[PDB]
Design an enzyme around this catalytic site. Structure first.
Site, PDB file in Angstrom:
ATOM      1  N   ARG B  42       4.082  51.800 -10.031  1.00 42.64           N
ATOM      2  CA  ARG B  42       3.860  51.326 -11.342  1.00 42.64           C
ATOM      3  C   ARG B  42       3.316  52.159 -12.453  1.00 42.64           C
ATOM      4  O   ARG B  42       3.954  52.205 -13.698  1.00 42.64           O
ATOM      5  CB  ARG B  42       2.785  50.201 -11.218  1.00 42.64           C
ATOM      6  N   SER B 147       0.011  31.689  -8.561  1.00 43.05           N
ATOM      7  CA  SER B 147      -1.152  31.709  -9.227  1.00 43.05           C
ATOM      8  C   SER B 147      -2.159  32.981  -8.996  1.00 43.05           C
ATOM      9  O   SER B 147      -2.535  33.097  -7.842  1.00 43.05           O
ATOM     10  CB  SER B 147      -2.022  30.489  -9.101  1.00 43.05           C
ATOM     11  N   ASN B 148      -2.372  33.843  -9.882  1.00 38.24           N
ATOM     12  CA  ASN B 148      -3.149  35.076 -10.035  1.00 38.24           C
ATOM     13  C   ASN B 148      -4.493  34.907 -10.614  1.00 38.24           C
ATOM     14  O   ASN B 148      -4.451  34.671 -11.872  1.00 38.24           O
ATOM     15  CB  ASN B 148      -2.238  36.322 -10.225  1.00 38.24           C
ATOM     16  N   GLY B 172      -5.299  37.153  -5.040  1.00 40.60           N
ATOM     17  CA  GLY B 172      -6.755  37.513  -5.377  1.00 40.60           C
ATOM     18  C   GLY B 172      -6.512  38.959  -5.896  1.00 40.60           C
ATOM     19  O   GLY B 172      -5.775  39.696  -6.195  1.00 40.60           O
ATOM     20  N   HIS B 201       3.760  21.513   4.913  1.00 43.30           N
ATOM     21  CA  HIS B 201       3.974  21.472   6.369  1.00 43.30           C
ATOM     22  C   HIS B 201       5.228  20.793   6.596  1.00 43.30           C
ATOM     23  O   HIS B 201       5.737  20.881   7.932  1.00 43.30           O
ATOM     24  CB  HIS B 201       2.823  21.123   7.250  1.00 43.30           C
ATOM     25  N   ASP B 205       7.285  25.197   8.418  1.00 48.55           N
ATOM     26  CA  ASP B 205       6.094  25.484   9.312  1.00 48.55           C
ATOM     27  C   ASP B 205       5.380  26.612   9.573  1.00 48.55           C
ATOM     28  O   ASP B 205       5.754  27.574   8.667  1.00 48.55           O
ATOM     29  CB  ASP B 205       6.756  24.867  10.723  1.00 48.55           C
TER      30      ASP B 205
END
Lengths: 228, 228, 228, 228
Positions: B42, B147-148, B172, B201, B205
């Site tokens: 980056r 979702s960060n 995270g 689920h 799986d």
């Protein structure tokens, strides 16, 4: 996109999972278990076996889970909306992934079976599951489920309780981690495994689940204590 | 106390979250990804961009998620109670926090878009979301959600699957951790980021979710492999 | 002497070459590309692939040509005597030599295909061409052609534009050359590969062709920039 | 795709290129010119100029081309199908790239104009071309054309002869190259610039073109010889 029809087996599995997540108030407790002594003991046992059998880490995990279930029978219970059935035997369902999905062959009387017997039973049932030859009584029932995904590199995960049981032990991968030590370098290397127990809060409260996990961790950290 | 009236938008969001949690049997798998190679790549890419654009870590995460969804299409499916719709395109919804709540602008065809295109699309959609001009087609739909919350210091978290999708990747913060190494000091410093994938689920799986996380981790730990 | 009758296929190819050289005002621009980073990235990618696929230098060249065509769409046009058709997709014809002559299997959507997909497509189409099983749509059309003769030791060469395209990239052999450097020895060794782009001067003027070659050279000299 | 209509100006340019490539049998000769002395003389001249004017390398190239055309008048001829018109004056067309295409403003009497006058004329005509204010007599005609693409990094290229002229000099980029020398290190560093002269083989044969290129190379390799 492509619409893949849902098989009846998959519909049954999905309905069971929906029932579990809708009727069982799951809550998850995670701990870390030091596996150096288990690895040493397993290596010694495999050397002594001389190729007659092979003891795996999952066998130690199943044995420790059975003994911890004996010590803390609340994790070996079931909720039946009128009474709490406290099973006196420990039938450990083991999650196995097959091309047709997830199936749970049961190792019966794991609290009295030895490590070699448990390993042989696990290999036989896994072969039957992969070949699609499992009988309904060999995977329906049980009192405690173990789902191990460490071989896929999962650090830890939270599983879904298989009804009507009260707990399921989710097992992650073993990784080397640095820890404080009273030595010249100031640290040591230990192979730790992260295990997460998902408990039915109706039957197993936080203190009972924590006691179960502590007993399990003690049994794994001192393998000779499974002789008691 | 003070009673704050619930807006219709908040009521719709709450109803969607309720529907997800009652109709989707969530289960969560967490891993750790080494981010040093991504940081180096980056930095080099940002230097060669010469201010024309700026690539964030979330762009690498989106690209890796799209490629992992291509490799494991089960995470790119949806349950429709009769068939499992396996989407062949990857439209990544991205969670954005605005003063009006959480919204999910969709980066379409993230599996074929480049890092610059992904970064520009994310910036434009985030600006549109913050200023409140998102069209319904720009945030309704999608096949996989990211979702960060690393910018807020969260180590890890478990998110709620946005229906009718089958998975959501919760990201995270990235932190420096010591790890054993075969060097004189006995250890090295690596910046790892913990990611938790919440899976339906019924469709995904444990083995499939673990495989998806393994591919995602491989893509992020070796960015040049995103050229494949 | 011996008079070898001209086959109809050879007559068609010769007539196409006549049409190209008579109606297309070719002009040629040559540059040198440093391939050390390409070789390093290719080695790393091949080691990661673990024998599932093998990536060649021509795959990097095709990907870089497609991305450069995206950046400079003039080289991706066609002259139709009334309008200049600017193709928005990049279908890369690849020159393959077979005992029956020269053929041009088409890698469609090379601007969105990955290196592994491009390599697999090139291998499959080359096998089909060598076995004489190519369908007409698999070698008729395309927007940009690549002819590589580095395997035969050609330093550089100027190819004929395949109609109705506007450009063709002729790739020569890669050789080690000494170049000045700010080190103790005063020089360094770099593997440089010379490419000559033949452009239709009706569509692509000198500045546009030079811009295309500069973009191609940048993409190859830093492969990580192919992710943008 | 997108069909861009062809403007009448572009149609005229394309028709001229057709006429050139169809009626002029081009053949190309390439040489390398050492530019260290040119750079030193240019630096000294710019420092003497004190900002009144700035001399570019293209000014040296234009002056050297004009003097070489004086020495070898065959390159300063035109084929008229009945006689070979040998122009006694040197009007150097200079290729300028503008957003509307390629244009050729003419520096008249470059064989007698000085470097400062040539630089000022080139700057003024380039500004006029970029602003679209060139009169027809300012870009129609000429006896010899120079097209410089070194600013775009082109190593070398072959241009199309602008009719009815007999030659066109294509100038590439100047790069540092190692060459053997009788010193302790065994090598030296020189900034060499590669030029390709495209000649009409009806008027200029190989020996004459080579003589022209040798004269041009001598003039550039020793700028003080431009005073003769």
């Amino acid at each position: 996109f492509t619409d893949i029809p849902i098989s009846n087996i998959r519909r049954v599995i999905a309905q069971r999972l929906m029932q579990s997540k809708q009727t069982i108030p799951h809550y998850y407790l995670s701990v870390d278990v030091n596996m150096g002594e288990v690895l040493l003991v397993r290596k010694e046992l495999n050397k002594m076996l001389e190729g007659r059998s092979k003891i795996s880490v999952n066998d130690f995990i199943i044995k420790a889970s059975a003994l911890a279930c004996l010590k803390v029978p609340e994790a070996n219970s079931s909720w039946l909306d009128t009474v709490i059935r406290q099973n006196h035997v420990v039938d450990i369902s083991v999650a196995v992934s097959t091309p047709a999905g997830l199936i749970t062959p049961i190792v019966f009387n794991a609290h009295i079976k030895g490590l070699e017997t448990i390993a042989n039973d696990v290999v036989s049932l896994a072969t039957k599951a992969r070949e699609g030859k499992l009988q309904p009584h060999e995977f329906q029932g049980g009192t405690f489920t173990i789902s191990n995904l460490g071989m896929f590199g999962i650090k830890n995960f939270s599983a879904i309780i298989n009804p009507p049981q009260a707990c399921i032990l989710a097992v992650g991968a073993s990784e080397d981690r640095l820890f404080p030590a009273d030595n010249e370098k100031g640290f040591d290397v230990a192979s730790m495994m992260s295990v997460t127990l998902s408990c039915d809060h109706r039957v197993v409260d936080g203190a009972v689940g924590a006691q179960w996990l502590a007993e399990f961790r003690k049994y794994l950290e001192k393998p000779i204590t499974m002789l008691l």
